Amino acid sequence: HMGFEGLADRLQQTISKIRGKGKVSEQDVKEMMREVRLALLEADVNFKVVKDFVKKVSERAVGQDVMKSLTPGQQVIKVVQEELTELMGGEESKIAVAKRPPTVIMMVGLQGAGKTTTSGKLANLLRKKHNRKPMLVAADIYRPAAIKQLETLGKQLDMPVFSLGDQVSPVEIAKQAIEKAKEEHYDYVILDTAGRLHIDHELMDELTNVKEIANPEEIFLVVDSMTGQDAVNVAKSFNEQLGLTGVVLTKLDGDTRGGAALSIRAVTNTPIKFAGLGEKLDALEPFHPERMASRILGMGDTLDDFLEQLGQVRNMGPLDELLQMMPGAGKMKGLKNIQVDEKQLNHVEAIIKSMTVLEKEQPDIINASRRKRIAKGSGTSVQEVNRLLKQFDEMKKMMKQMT
RNA sequence: GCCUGCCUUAAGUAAGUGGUGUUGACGUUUGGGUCCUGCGCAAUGGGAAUUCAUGAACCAUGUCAGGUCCGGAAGGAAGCAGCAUUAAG
Numbered sequence: 245h246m247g248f249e250g251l252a253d254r255l256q257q258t259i260s261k262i263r264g265k266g267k268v269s270e271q272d273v274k275e276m277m278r279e280v281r282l283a284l285l286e287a288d289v290n291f292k293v294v295k296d297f298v299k300k301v302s303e304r305a306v307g308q309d310v311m312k313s314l315t316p317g318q319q320v321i322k323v324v325q326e327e328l329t330e331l332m333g334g335e336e337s338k339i340a341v342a343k344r345p346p347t348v349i350m351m352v353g354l355q356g357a358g359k360t361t362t363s364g365k366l367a368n369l370l371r372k373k374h375n376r377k378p379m380l381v382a383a384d385i386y387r388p389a390a391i392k393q394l395e396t397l398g399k400q401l402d403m404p405v406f407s408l409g410d411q412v413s414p415v416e417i418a419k420q421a422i423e424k425a426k427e428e429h430y431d432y433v434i435l436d437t438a439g440r441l442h443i444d445h446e447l448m449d450e451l452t453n454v455k456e457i458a459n460p461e462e463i464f465l466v467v468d469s470m471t472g473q474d475a476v477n478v479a480k481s482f483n484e485q486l487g488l489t490g491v492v493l494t495k496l497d498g499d500t501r502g503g504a505a506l507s508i509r510a511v512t513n514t515p516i517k518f519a520g521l522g523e524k525l526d527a528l529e530p531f532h533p534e535r536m537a538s539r540i541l542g543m544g545d546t547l548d549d550f551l552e553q554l555g556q557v558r559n560m561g562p563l564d565e566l567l568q569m570m571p572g573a574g575k576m577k578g579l580k581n582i583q584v585d586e587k588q589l590n591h592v593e594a595i596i597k598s599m600t601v602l603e604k605e606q607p608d609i610i611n612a613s614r615r616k617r618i619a620k621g622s623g624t625s626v627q628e629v630n631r632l633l634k635q636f637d638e639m640k641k642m643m644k645q646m647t
Numbered sequence: 648g649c650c651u652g653c654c655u656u657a658a659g660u661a662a663g664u665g666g667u668g669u670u671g672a673c674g675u676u677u678g679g680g681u682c683c684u685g686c687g688c689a690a691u692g693g694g695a696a697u698u699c700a701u702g703a704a705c706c707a708u709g710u711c712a713g714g715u716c717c718g719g720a721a722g723g724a725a726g727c728a729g730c731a732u733u734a735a736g
């Protein structure tokens with residue numbers, strides 16, 4: 245949904261020049277790449293990653309006109325898209341599933357990254373998308389309000405939150421937590437671990453002790469996307485002093501650059517598994533490097549009863565499959581239209597639910613005063629009613645043309 | 648010119664056949680209608696005033712899905728299928 249908006253803005257005007265011109269020249273690719281290189285540098289992408297990326301794209305883009313003279317510029321875009329995709333990890337990296345339940349997932353990171361919130365988001369995702377039965381664990385004893393924060397999120401999910409207070413070691417908390425999860429048949433155990441503002445020795449000593457007693461199948465670093473290269477460095481230090489298997493990037497809804505997301509793989513070899521997209525518990529999505537690459541480049545992929553079904557499936561029934569979300573991402577690339585219904589759509593739905601069942605079955609049976617009364621009940625005098633009838637006639641004509 | 652025809656014109660006179668009344672307004676006239684035609688009517692039939700179940704988008708029906716507005720809040724609010732829902736079938 246969210247992220248990278250600033251890099252896109254920059255790239256997409258240089259992309260404009262090449263896409264329109266089918267012809268590929270030595271000077272054209274050089275020029276596009278100079279702009280691409282400046283945009284990646286200003287987005288705080290790792291410096292070595294930039295210089296390697298500009299090299300591999302430019303090499304492929306001048307054998308590509310030799311590759312193909314058909315749709316040549318649209319070929320240059322496909323190379324950039326393919327390299328952006330590899331740069332953010334090849335393909336979706338799915339959650340591990342232990343051979344024997346429970347799967348123990350360790351959440352680590354620095355204070356303020358979003359550990360505690362993301363723990364709750366991941367539990368939520370495991371139950372809704374995968375039909376799992378998770379358990380949250382309170383292993384950060386070093387701040388007050390930390391436990392109560394997790395417990396509060398747990399009460400909104402109806403999921404247990406294991407805690408022994410703040411006078412007991414996190415090694416013991418993790419141990420008992422995992423054994424209760426075995427006895428009571430919980431699929432997943434999510435450990436919310438400690439952390440101050442900066443790494444120290446007595447953070448890593450504790451985290452290695454917890455890994456030891458817990459033998460986790462996944463160790464996720466939760467890291468703030470808006471910190472750019474500082475996030476890449478936090479990743480490097482965690483991956484070296486214990487083992488990371490994954491990364492959760494938080495606060496993409498405030499990250500217009502994307503430096504961290506374009507750099508984590510190449511510097512640490514750790515894959516990005518999820519993105520946080522907001523404060524609520526349901527703002528977590530799997531990281532899909534194709535679709536972000538496509539995003540960055542502006543590249544995509546009974547009349548009354550039918551109206552009621554369209555209103556149900558369009559207003560609150562959003563959620564397509566078979567790459568429907570991928571081709572419809574960003575309003576299907578905007579579609580050259582800057583107007584959304586919103587309250588206009590709400591008024592259209594209110595005008596739609598202004599007629600009887602017979603009027604819904606036969607829309608042409610309404611007399612002039614017959615839907616003058618309906619317009620008085622709806623709020624638009626004749627304008628909304630006649631626009632709705634014109635739209636229904638246009639939809640009928642389109643259905644007759646399609647059939 | 649009835650010598651034959653005035654038989655159709657002022658009674659009949661009589662053999663043949665089923666009956667029948669006139670002094671009696673009699674009675675052995677047994678069995679049928681005894682107003683057929685207009686006035687005020689009552690067996691009897693045809694459609695009834697009124698009885699029990701169901702029924703108006705606006706358009707008469709109390710809040711009688713909701714959305715807009717007045718309002719940080721609430722109520723008025725297609726009272727749309729359901730409710731009393733009538734006379735209208």
Ligand SMILES: Nc1nc2c(ncn2[C@@H]2O[C@H](COP(=O)(O)OP(=O)(O)O)[C@@H](OP(=O)(O)OP(=O)(O)O)[C@H]2O)c(=O)[nH]1
Pocket residue numbers: 353354355356357358359360361362494495496497498520521522523527
């Ligand atoms: N917009 C957005 N926010 C996220 C996201 N993930 C986490 N946060 C926010 O970051 C802040 C830290 O979250 P925690 O859950 O406490 O992280 P921690 O355990 O690592 O300390 C929280 O709010 P906070 O403490 O109130 O933030 P602030 O007031 O310090 O700025 C949280 O709402 C995300 O994906 N999008």
